[PDB]
Paper text:
Here, we focused on the tardigrade Ramazzottius varieornatus, one of the toughest animals on Earth. A transcriptome database of R. varieornatus shows that genes encoding a Ferritin‐like protein are upregulated during desiccation or ultraviolet radiation. This protein shows sequence similarity to enigmatic proteins in desiccation‐tolerant bacteria and plants, which are hypothesized to be desiccation‐related. Our results indicate that through cleaning up damaged metabolites or regulation of metabolite levels, this phosphatase family can contribute to stress tolerances.
Residue numbers in the entry:
A (entry chain A), B (entry chain A): 18 to 236, 245 to 295
The structure:
Amino acid sequence: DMTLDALNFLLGVEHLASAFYVQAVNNFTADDFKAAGLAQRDYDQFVGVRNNEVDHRDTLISVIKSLGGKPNPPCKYTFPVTDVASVLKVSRTLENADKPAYLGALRDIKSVELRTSVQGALSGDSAHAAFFAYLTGKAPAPGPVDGPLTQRHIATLAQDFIVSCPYPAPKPFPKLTLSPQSGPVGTVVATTCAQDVDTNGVMCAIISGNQGTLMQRPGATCTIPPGVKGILFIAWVRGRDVLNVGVDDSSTVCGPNYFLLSALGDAVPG
Amino acid sequence: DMTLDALNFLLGVEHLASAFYVQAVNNFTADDFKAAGLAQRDYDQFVGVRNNEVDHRDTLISVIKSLGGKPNPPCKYTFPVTDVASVLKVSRTLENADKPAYLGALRDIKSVELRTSVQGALSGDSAHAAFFAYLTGKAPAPGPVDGPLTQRHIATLAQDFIVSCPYPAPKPFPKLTLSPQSGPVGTVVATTCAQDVDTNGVMCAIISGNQGTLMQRPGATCTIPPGVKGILFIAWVRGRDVLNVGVDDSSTVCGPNYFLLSALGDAVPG
Ligand SMILES: [Mg+2]
Ligand SMILES: [Mg+2]
Ligand SMILES: [Zn+2]
Ligand SMILES: [Zn+2]
């Protein structure tokens, strides 16, 4: 049923993340982290993230089996890892994307006890995201409310890390490149779609956790509007038949991709 | 109904926290934080926490009104604030307690859209907790899964900050003092109840997010068992008629209080 499908979707998310962290711990040591300016405790927490994500994955496998389901296996991955900076970038990207993934999946999970367990893992990924934000100079808590995205939206965020999957996984939309990918309200973002999408009738969809989706004609640019807070997900949608894009992808034509809106807590002088 | 009651309970939690942060920002400046060894970005994030918690409170008020409810007003508070260290201690305490509060309340909230909003705020408080953990030398993500506590358990955690409430709020259990209040597996914790509770038949209840409640006869001491991860909540319960104490307080006789289990990511040399 939809509960099982939601859990298997989260297992796909956690297969990818756990695979990344397991491999990264094997390829990077505390000395590598210290050479990059980090502390022993930061490497230790990184190992803790690995351990926590192995648990998040293994818990989903167990629960799916207990419900009579068939747990998804891992896909084949590719991670753009060179130096410690790139490890932190991939980590931040994965953990930021966890929140909308879990929030979307929780809409479909039917029992109280199951929701409690899954919410309790979301809380953990949220703590991981705050850690990686802080280590990369971004506010660990850039806004009050994280919002959902759909399974296909999450596949779109993850697509550059997936070589192939041995089952029919949620299909991504074309990637939307954002330049720049961070900045304050009023930033004019140049948006480029990986596929030749006709922008006639397209709206920029700025998907926020606190204000929902804000939609505006592109300039192809999208402008960061006032009032939104937290991480933003920017997509192209065709028309406005869908007003709440975070819960309905039926008008999405490119993206979303993440945009790191400036916030109190970002690194600043002094 | 129970949804309204759960939201009003969370509004009590967020009245207390927002009141603390609003007052603390008025009494402490970035220069105070810098004199304590912190950075401008840490003060900025602290202001962001205030802003986020004002939003968490105000959102609950609005939602309760929209459901035809009567939002709880603030209680009268007392916060043990002297220096910056004490600000961070109170902050960490409040944010750590948010997670079980929201997780318990979510068991009672009936609609998909409401749960999405409330889960999205929990995600934010989880990020706040990770920030304050990191600033105080504790792992920002000490375990994989955060677990629930009941409304009365949350009142017990909060009781030292409440002078009075102008409505019948959830009643605390007697405070359980833990010495020490942090340490690794195997730590023997001396536990003292604020009221003269007879320990004949009492069990130590070690309430973990990953393994549930573990119960053992006291020594009055409780020993941290293997296998638990994350923040622990330690209570005295009478008998074992309740096995899952995080969702049923009907056997609780003292506590819980929090215990900061050592974890990868805690401050360590190098
Ligand atoms: Mg994660
Ligand atoms: Mg909070
Ligand atoms: Zn996870
Ligand atoms: Zn809050």
